[PDB]
Structure 1
Amino acid sequence: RPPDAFVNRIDRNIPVPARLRHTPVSLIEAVNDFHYAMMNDEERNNFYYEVLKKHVTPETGVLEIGAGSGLLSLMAAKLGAKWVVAVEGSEELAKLARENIRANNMEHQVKVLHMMSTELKSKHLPEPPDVLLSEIFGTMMLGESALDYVVDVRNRLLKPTTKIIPQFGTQYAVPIECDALHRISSVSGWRDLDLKHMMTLQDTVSIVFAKHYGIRMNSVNFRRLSDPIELFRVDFSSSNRNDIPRRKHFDVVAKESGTAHAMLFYWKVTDDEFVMSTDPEDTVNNFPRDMQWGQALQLLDASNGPLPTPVVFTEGKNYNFECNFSGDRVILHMQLC
């Protein structure tokens, strides 16, 4: 009986079926919160299948960072890989991956190791892999430290001819007007009652996932006020942290007049002709993707006064933004200068 069995925190008058009772709550939460949505992103699954298909042969050894359900590792095995090893940091997700492997009679082909990729050593593998596979992207592309984890494996366990899937990733930002977002992130007053003091607290610093607001970008009216800003691009086979500056400046030309309530962040990952994008334009008919990755938002303050100042764009004018990054390049912030 696990100390964190699901049944423990449920009220004793509420029924819990046997299949859930003694399962750790953390696993039920991970699968219900994330994994069903991931597995229903058919375009994501197809992207990985098509890219793997270009590379996997009976002679190809495949290493995956982050087994999860085991789906992508199962794909590599389906495609006839020589061997597949997947690392998974979560003990319970590792067990679950093994169950899915068992269900598809592939225990002889796919091995799941419970460990973080940082702890993986050459002795844990039959030989250096021909393919390195991962899907550890966040709502922000590098949100789950994809670059750092791939770099660590790339430095230590691969060989010169190893194909890293996926190869490329680009993080974008675009200033947007969005009245729905504005109405849940600001206030002025109610009739003759002044509530402007509430604005002193407006969080124009944090990156917040659209999901956290309760919003799906594809389901509200918003306007992109400029062409997309490429914040940075990485090649997972060659890039390092220092390929991304700690501070960058961008000249943003307004294509539309309006209020830039927020910066909208989305990304695009590619490998040869195949593309995995979180641009709302590309996810109108991909509800599971909008639920699993969605997009991120940072509210914009034009200045540093006692109250936030709206960022107002006039068509045809230039707007300079300073982008600051954390050391690991995971956290960023856009400030009008």
Structure 2
Amino acid sequence: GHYGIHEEMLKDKIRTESYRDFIYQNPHIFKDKVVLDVGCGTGILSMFAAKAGAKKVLGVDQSEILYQAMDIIRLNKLEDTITLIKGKIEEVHLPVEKVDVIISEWMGYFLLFESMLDSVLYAKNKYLAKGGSVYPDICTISLVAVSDVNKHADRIAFWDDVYGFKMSCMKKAVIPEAVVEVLDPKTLISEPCGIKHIDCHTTSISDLEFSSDFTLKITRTSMCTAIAGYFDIYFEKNCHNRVVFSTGPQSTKTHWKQTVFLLEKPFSVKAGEALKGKVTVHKNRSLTVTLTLNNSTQTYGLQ
């Protein structure tokens, strides 16, 4: 849509340079191939593919941004290789039956919030040639335990005394809202636990709604105040130069930051304890995350 989204994504060096490195360092995946960029935005991924030796690149975006991409492709004299089409990938007519390669940046906060994966899976199933490839091809979601009584008090306890007046009843609107923010790695009190693994080659839309039992290996005796979620992105299939980036707190921050699920009742944990919980994701545009931990259940959404 608005240029501000595309500025934020383009200024994410981890995001954009991971895609650039994967493409430039694996040109055999692109040489003389037909490539589809699903949600191309400004078209930077289409221009990477072009430079790595793509025969033909089809950039598709439903938003106004595609008209800026048309000027950008002309400014870079790539109009002979990159053809741009406005519309939903679900609706547009392509000047080919099949593509060799699909690339997309489809990933939302906590991977699946307001994600485009459903649109990318549609492209796969309709347009991907026999033996073709989609990138990134592998994604994981992780949870990690957090101790931060100060940030918890800033968001929750805050409402008990507001310039001398009780606003306690506000807590019930705040707890259920997941927070997208950068965590201080110092506040992590468990080993991470994988809760979801996706190969975009084999996954369906139905697999994006899932449940996982998890265990957090507690590494610090502390008050547990939150669970943080993040995702890892991998470019693996047919790569001589494989590329991974993490949106986890231990790694260089990205525009995805981390997704934080606040506990109503923080509870003490011991170094070496195996903290057992359950999480379920429902596509209930807008998706929800149900967490069971310490004999309490809360459903979280994102604003």
TM over 0.5: yes
Summarize the alignment of residues 274-313 of structure 1 with structure 2, pairs less than 5 Å apart: 274-283=243-252, 286=253, 289=254, 292-301=255-264, 309-313=265-269
**Aligned with 1:164: secondary structure?**
strand
Aligned runs of 1:103-252 on 2, under 5 Å? 103-121=75-93, 124-187=94-157, 195=166, 197-198=168-169, 200-201=171-172, 203-210=174-181, 216-218=182-184, 222-243=186-207, 246-252=210-216
Unaligned runs of 5+ in 1: 1-26, 211-215, 302-308
Distance 1:95 1:199, change over 3 A: closer
Residue in 2 that maps onto 1:333: 290
Q: 1:118 to 1:180 in 2, by over 3 A?
A: farther
Contact 2:152 2:262 in 1 (8 A): no
Q: How many angstroms apart in 2 are the aligned matches of 1:267 and 1:67?
A: 22
- What is the CA RMSD across the aligned residues, in angstroms? 2.5
Structure possessing the higher radius of gyration over alpha carbons: 1
Structure 1 equivalent of residue 231 of structure 2: 267
Indicate if the aligned counterparts of 2:195 and 2:213 stay in contact, CA closer than 8 A.
no
Deviation at 1:45, TM superposition (A): 2.2
Per-residue deviation, residues 233-252 of structure 1 (Å, max 9, x unmatched): 10011112444564332233
| Residue pair 1:205, 1:333 contacting (<8 A) in 2 also | no
Distance in 1 of aligned mates of 2:73 and 2:209: 42
Q: Secondary structure at the match of 1:160?
A: strand
Check conservation: 1:134, 1:166, Cα contact below 8 A.
yes
Paired AA for residue 150 in structure 1: V
Cα separation, partners in 2 of 1:110 and 1:294, compared to 1, 3 Å: same
Higher share in strand: 2
Partners of 1:37 and 1:110 in 2: CA distance? 24
| Regions of 4+ moved over 4 Å | 188-191, 193-196
Corresponding residue for 2:222?
258
CA distance in 1, matches of 2:128, 2:156: 50
Q: TM-score, normalised by structure 1?
A: 0.76
Q: Provide the rounded CA distance (Å) in 2 between the counterparts of 1:330 and 1:161.
A: 32
Deviation readout 1:304-335 (Å, 9 max, x if unpaired): xxxxx223322233322121211479432322
Preserved contact between residue 180 and residue 258 of structure 2 (Cα < 8 Å): yes
CA contact (8 A) 2:86 2:92 kept: no
Residue 253 (structure 1) shift: 3.1
How many residue pairs match? The answer is 284
Structure-2 separation of matches of 1:151 and 1:52? 21
Q: CA deviation at 1:130?
A: 1.0
The offset of 1:195, in angstroms, is: 4.2
Gaps of 5+ in 2: 237-241, 296-303
Segment drifting more, 194-203 vs 165-174: 194-203
Distance 2:30 2:175 in 1: 50
> C-alpha distance in 1, partners of 2:10/2:86?
21
Against the structure 1 CA distance between its residues 235 and 330, is the aligned structure 2 distance closer, same or farther, given a 3 Å change threshold? farther
SS at match of 2:107: coil
TM-score by length of 2: 0.84
